Every structure is written in structure tokens, then in C-alpha cells.
Amino acid sequence: INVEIKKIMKANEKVTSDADPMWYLKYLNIYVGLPDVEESFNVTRPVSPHECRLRDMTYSAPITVDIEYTRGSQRIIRNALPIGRMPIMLRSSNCVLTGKTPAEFAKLNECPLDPGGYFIVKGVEKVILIQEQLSKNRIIVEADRKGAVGASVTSSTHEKKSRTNMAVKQGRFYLRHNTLSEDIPIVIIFKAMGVESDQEIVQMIGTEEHVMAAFGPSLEECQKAQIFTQMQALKYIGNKVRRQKTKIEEARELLASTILTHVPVKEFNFRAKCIYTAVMVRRVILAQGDNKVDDRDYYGNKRLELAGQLLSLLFEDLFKKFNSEMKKIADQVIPKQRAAQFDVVKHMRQDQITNGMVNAISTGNWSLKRFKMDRQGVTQVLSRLSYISALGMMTRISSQFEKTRKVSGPRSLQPSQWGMLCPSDTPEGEACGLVKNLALMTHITTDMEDGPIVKLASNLGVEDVNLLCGEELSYPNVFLVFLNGNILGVIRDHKKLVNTFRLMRRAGYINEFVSISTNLTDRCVYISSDGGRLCRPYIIVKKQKPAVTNKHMEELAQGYRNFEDFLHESLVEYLDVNEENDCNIALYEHTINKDTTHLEIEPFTLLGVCAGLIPYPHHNQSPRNTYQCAMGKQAMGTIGYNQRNRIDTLMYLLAYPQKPMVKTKTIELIEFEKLPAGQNATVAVMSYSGYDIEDALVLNKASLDRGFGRCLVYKNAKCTLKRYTNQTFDK
């Protein structure tokens, strides 16, 4: 709501129509304002989330913007015009709950311990779960149904998304794209992308004996035909191109923009794309031998899209639709309406965006036609069964598969989930393995500018890939360096590069969220700077001694420093999955050896919110903990201090709730002791009367009479008396 909305408004700042030139509509700045209600007669009034829940309305703020247009060639400006309503998230920057004390929360009828972060539309509380997907702009080598070890890459840019594959079905590399009639050899594409020398092509593919032996068939198939020049290759490509020299022009355009969109070309300079496809073919050849097939379940290549990105995409799509509708209305009205000059303010529909947002948040089905994205189940009703239930449902993660096949691969627990997601917390049922929860200590990175990153990479001696041929890529000491899937270049002695980059990041000149990883099997150093990546804090260890000491901990306890000061003093740093894949971590101080770079902050943090309630979990079984979390997600107890004023369709409360005697540090952190969901009873483990044969238990009549286990079920009965079109009303 602060930066992305402004960027979208700047991208769509100017909109004009083809007919009647010199007419335009320029937006200057968009505002969201504070949450207001349109109940009063053309009057705004602050409304609270509790009042919204009670009245079954939406908790949104009026979206306003300033604009300037030309009615009759005379520029007319408007400093404040409403255009829609954006549902404001609770405890946000513009929300009324933020910056409030418990006294003000009580005055506004809201629980201070409420986690918030959910939207309120038409009275129901919806939460946007964190969607999980595969990392974009990355080569994935995998086996086909017939066992062929091929490669794939889904280049997704801000405009289009295209998945291009490469197969070795017949010993030669055939490239397949959705815009081609039939897959064509890779040598023809090489010749079409400027590089026509077979020697240069072979040097780019590789200089190894086995590489040449495996690539021979492709050269033979290419020589069989009469394709030897870029013109002939482009003609063949155009002939093989599907309908949407003209064919040559279309082939060149598809090679420059459509295929491998993530690889930029300065001016029809396909050098970078040629190097990229050569590296891809080299990886495919190296994989065709030893079965080093990459796995999809490796979360190091996963990206989590929070509600922010989804809302930004939805707002951009709705704004584009509104601009198109306004342009159409203008084209239809201005040329044949009347001498009276037409302006947009008379057709600036303010309900379009509001209805779009309300529907996208309520129904949960998101259909973005500009991106061809049809998702379902994005929003779910916040489970108010208990405070623990809500706090655990708020930190859930949905998968991209959505129960499309019982693969058992992604449903399994991968070692990559260390410290990021809770291993034991998982719903028991058909959604086992696809619905996960975040760990107690983790973070999700955002998008950076990458400017200083590229500058430092270029200054650290990274040689330009266009200055040297691809032969250097086959050397054992020359390691490639990639930046967000794009080939940043080559380098030698990657140890120095990685050390200097990490030292600079710790100093602070580079954002601490930029991850750097190195894979020796492929000799590739990846520099990740995109958002959605999972990171975890770790204490830096140097020469068998952590940087954090008792003095630092005492200063933190007294209040002289904070976690930000620790981050700035090169004491604690964030590590990504791909970074910890190469870095060494220690669990405890006694485990620290000579070959150690980081130290685990706390082990129990591996467990999630729902799992933190388990007292002594490492002494029990894993299915036990899973069932315990599943039952805690439905446990009965108090919701908040405003549970009496809260009116829901179904609520369960306990008469005499008591806090546990064996409470965990996670409980103390989440403040669950203040809102317990159970009671401590003097249980005696034994068999009595044979009424506890299979998991059953025997209760005491007197204990139940004295108030033990007394529960309260609160239901809501709603009735509506509305006025119809005619002047009549239900009475």
C-alpha cells in the first residue's frame, strides 16, 4: 500500500485514446486514506473492525487520486477524486489498531493479543495464505516419461511467461516451444542467433571428449540439411513458426523476445542467449551420464508469494481494465455525443475496483486474464475455534500442486525445511504434506534494486561474458556466476569472490537479504536477490568462537543494543537455504569444530507455533505430535478479551480455563498462558472398570459436577429485513 501501489500508478500514469488526439488523463499521485464507512449520507466516519464484523460490512478505506485531463483543450485538474475502496488489513500501517494501547483496544472492542493481519469483508474474516511455487528463470534438468533426461526453463518477465524445453529423444537436442509447429535442432537456433561457426558452437557447448561424442549427432543432423547461414536458419524457423521476409522477421522477433525472455538483448545481440543455451546444453550433457537429476522438492528453488504480491497483481489488472474501459467510453462518447466537451469524471466508475477487490477476497477465486492465472482457494475463513487455532492458521502455506496427483515427493518432509517450516505441524488427512506452517524463527525476503549488487560484481573482477568465447566455460577453474537466473559472467577462484561478497554484506554496503550460493558439481555461483526467499538468522562463528558473547547478551538484556545492532555489528546474519547448503552450522557450542561458520541460535525454534505447545516433544513420536497439532488447531478455549462482544456463527468457550503447569518458552512468547485452552486435572494412569479399553478414559461424576469440563456453545441467528424495488419493506 505504500510503494507498490505508487509504482503501479506511475506505470499506468498516462492513458489516452486514439481518436481525437491531444486528449489524455494523467494521474499524479494515488492515496489510500484511513479506513472509513460509506454508511452515512455522503459522509465519512471512522469505523472499527469490531463494528464491521457486527454490521456485516467491509473494513476498507476510500482510494483517492489526483488527476489532470483536457475537456475542451483546457487543462482541468482534480486534487482529490475517489476511484475505489481497498480493504485495509488489520494492524497495518493505516489501520486504526496500530499504535494503540490495550486501553484503546478495549475502548474500540478489540483484543490486544489478536494476531491480526487478516481482512474483514462482509463480516467474515478471510486470510490470504502464503502460496508456494517454483523459482522462475531457472534451468531444471529432469527425466521425461520415457526416461529421456531433458531440460526445461520457464522464463517469466513482467509481461509474458514462456516455458521452453529441450529433449534428447533421438540423441540430438531438440528445442520445443509453444510458438513453434515442430521442435527444431539446437544447431539451427545457434546459427540463427548469429553464431554460425560450428567450431564456436562446439567450443561453447564444451571441450570434453564425451561432450563432443554426445554432440556429434546434432552436428551431423545439421550438416545433413542445407542450413549454414543465419538467413537460412531464420527462414527455417519462420517456416516452422505457428500463425498468431515476414517469416524471417517473425522468427527473429520470437528468438529475441519470446524465447528466453529473462535473457536481455541490448540490440538484437544474442550473445548472452547463445551462452545461456550453451550452458544449458552442457548441463544436459553432464546429466546424461551420472544420474545427477535435480529435484523439485528442494525448497532452495521455491518462492513464497505473500498477500502483497497477489494484491499488487490484482490492483494492476483492475487498473488496466479500468483504463481500457475509460478509453472505450471516451472513444464512444467524444466523437458523436454533442458539441459539449466530454470528460472522464462523468464515467469514472468508483465501484469497479471496490467490487473487484471484495469478490477476489471473498470468493477466493482469482482470474487474471492479463497473466492467464486461474487460482482458487487463495482466501479461507479464519478459524476462530481458539487463539492457538487462529495463530496457527495465520502462518499456513499452501502448495502449487493443490492435490493434482499423489506424487508423495513434495508431500514428504525434505531436509531443506530445517529452521524454516515446522516439520511436525501438518494437517492430518488428504492435505498431509501440502499444507505447512512456518517455523518459530524465520523471515521472507523482499525484492531489492540489484544495482549495487551488479556494481560490486563488476568491480570484483567478473569478466564480461561477451569479451571471451565459450571455450573458457569448459575449464575446471572457471566458475560461472549467475544473477537471478541471468548469466552475470565468469570468474576464477570463487572462494575469494564469495568471501569478499559475504564480508561486504556483513559490513552493510549490500543488503543482508541478498543470498550467495556456490555449487561445485556445476561450478556455478548464484546470487539471489528476488523476494519470497526463506531466510533464518544465525550467529557468525570465526576461528572456533562465536562473535556473540556474554557481554553482548547482557547489553541486549539491559537495553543498550537490539537485534538490528547485532545485525549491523556483523554478529548475526541471515542465511538462505542455498547459502546454508554450502555453509556449515553448529547446533551447540560443544559441537563447534574447526570447520564451522555459523552457530544455531536455539534448537526448539525448529518447531512451529502449534508444535510449541507440545511439552517435551522430542520424547514422543512424530505421528503423536502431528495429531497433537491437528487437535490443538481445534482445541476449545478463550479467543480473546472481546469474546463476549464478539458474535460469530459458532464459538466454543470453557467455564474455568487454567494455564498449563508445564509451559514452554514458545507458550511464554505467544502469550498463550494468558488465553489457555484447557485445564490441569489429577489424572491417574491405570485400568478401571474396563471402560478405557481402546484410547477411552473414565471421568469423575463429582469432578464434572464441580464444574470440570463445562463448556459454552455460542451460536448466531441472523435475520435481514430489506427494502425491495417497490416502496415496501419486510416488517
Binding site: 540423441g171 556429434g216 549427432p217 551431423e220 545433413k224
Partner: protein, 248 residues
């Protein structure tokens, strides 16, 4: 029993290799009676089960042995008079594996479903040397076919059944005597029974379609019954034979 079974693993039947599909997937394949199954097994008995030499001999006879797996080097030599491919057969490895394969058998295997190479193209000079001199076929092919030859020649069958892909010598260590048998991961029981040294009277197979096509419908029924009983016993659960008999 489908629900009672947990689909365990590590059940190599005592060989610690040759992963075979057993459990609910195997029962599914059996009830489907597909012509081609996954990981088919063929158990064959030997006439001389106490001698390992004869066992390895029959193994080499039945197992497919490619030219590149026995030749120590294949070189495309372009002498100033002519170009040809010279294959050097490793007689040492041949006699170690006990394969009755020589230059004559290699020449006979060549010229079989290989771009119609005439007998005059292949020649023999030494005891373990094979010279192949192709010729332009005029069907969009020229003298530069030595590449395709180098590509598709090492994968030519010189001895063994084309259908058989792998064969191993299993040993039973009964206190009475230690016997040997052949476990073939192929889909051709007729060839295994026809090969010399194989006691075809006691040869069993896992592929119901092959059993039906070779030994008849009664043999297929008996094989289905035995396979279902074995797959059900592997999981420790027993079922009355009458159910499987009625199913078959």
C-alpha cells in the same frame, strides 16, 4: 489384504538387488493381465546345478552381449587407400566370461538389420579383428556414414536373446547341497527354455501373458495362482488358496 499391506521395501527376496514390484501394485498388474509388466522375472533351473562354470556358460548364452561390451577398442581408420572401422575383440575377456563368440560369429551378427550392410563389406583379417567398410546407399547417405556406424554399432547383439536384458546366477545353499539357478529380467520365456543347458521342464516366469502364449492357459492359471500366493505371503498375511483359484 490390500489395506492390510503397508507396501514395504528392502524385500529383495534374498539377493539384495533386482528391485521387483510387490504388493498392491503387483496385485494390480496381475489382475490387469497387461501384456508388458514392470520388472519381469524368469526363474530357470540348470541340468548341472553344482558346477559354476556351466552356470556362467548358460548365463553368457542367454544374456544379451553387445559388441561394445566385448570389444576393447573400435577405431575409424582412414588409410590413404580406404576408410573403415576396425573393432578389436578382447579374447581375454571373452574367455573369462566363457562366451562362445569369435570373429566369425561377430561377422555373422553384423549385416543384420543394420542399414543393409552387404556381407562383402565386413571382413576378417586377424583372429580378433573385424573390419567394416560401408558403401554409399544413395538414399540421402554418402561415404560419411562412419559416424552413424560408430553410433549404432557398439549396440549390436552378437550373442544372446535380444529380449533378455540382464541375467544373474542365484544360489540356494540348502544343507543337502548348494544349487544354482538363472534369474533373468527379461520378457521371453520361450527363448530361455529353448537355449541349451536350461531345464525347460522347471522354468517359471512372472509375465502372465508370456506364460499363456508359451505354456498354455492352464500354465498361465498356475503361474497366476503361485505369483499371487507368493506376493501375499511376502507380507506375512495368508489367504486360502480357493480364493485365488476361483479368481484365476
Amino acid at each position: 489384504p490390500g489395506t492390510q499391506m503397508t507396501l514395504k521395501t528392502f524385500h529383495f527376496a534374498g539377493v539384495a538387488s533386482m528391485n521387483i514390484t510387490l504388493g498392491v501394485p503387483r496385485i494390480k498388474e496381475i489382475i490387469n493381465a497387461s501384456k508388458a509388466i514392470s520388472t519381469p522375472i524368469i526363474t530357470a533351473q540348470l541340468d548341472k546345478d553344482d558346477d559354476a562354470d556351466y552356470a556362467r556358460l548358460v548365463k553368457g548364452r542367454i544374456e544379451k552381449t553387445l559388441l561394445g561390451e566385448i570389444s576393447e577398442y573400435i577405431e575409424e581408420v582412414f588409410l590413404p587407400d580406404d576408410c573403415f572401422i576396425l573393432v578389436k575383440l578382447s579374447l581375454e575377456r571373452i574367455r573369462l566370461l566363457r562366451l562362445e563368440v569369435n570373429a566369425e560369429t561377430v561377422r555373422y551378427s553384423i549385416c543384420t538389420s543394420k542399414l543393409r550392410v552387404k556381407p562383402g563389406d565386413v571382413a576378417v583379417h586377424g583372429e580378433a579383428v573385424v573390419c567394416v567398410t560401408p558403401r554409399e546407399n544413395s538414399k540421402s547417405s554418402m561415404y560419411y556414414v562412419l559416424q552413424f556406424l560408430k553410433e549404432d554399432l557398439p549396440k549390436v547383439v552378437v550373442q544372446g536373446i535380444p529380449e533378455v536384458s540382464r541375467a544373474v546366477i542365484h544360489i540356494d545353499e540348502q544343507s543337502g547341497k548348494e544349487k544354482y539357478k538363472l534369474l533373468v529380467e527379461g520378457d521371453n520365456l520361450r527363448a530361455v527354455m529353448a537355449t541349451h543347458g536350461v531345464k525347460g521342464t522347471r522354468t517359471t516366469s512372472n509375465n502372465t501373458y508370456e506364460v499363456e502364449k508359451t505354456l498354455g492357459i492352464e500354465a498361465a492359471r498356475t503361474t497366476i495362482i503361485n505369483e499371487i500366493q507368493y506376493t501375499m505371503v511376502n507380507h506375512g498375511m495368508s489367504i486360502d488358496r480357493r480364493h485365488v483359484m476361483l479368481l484365476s
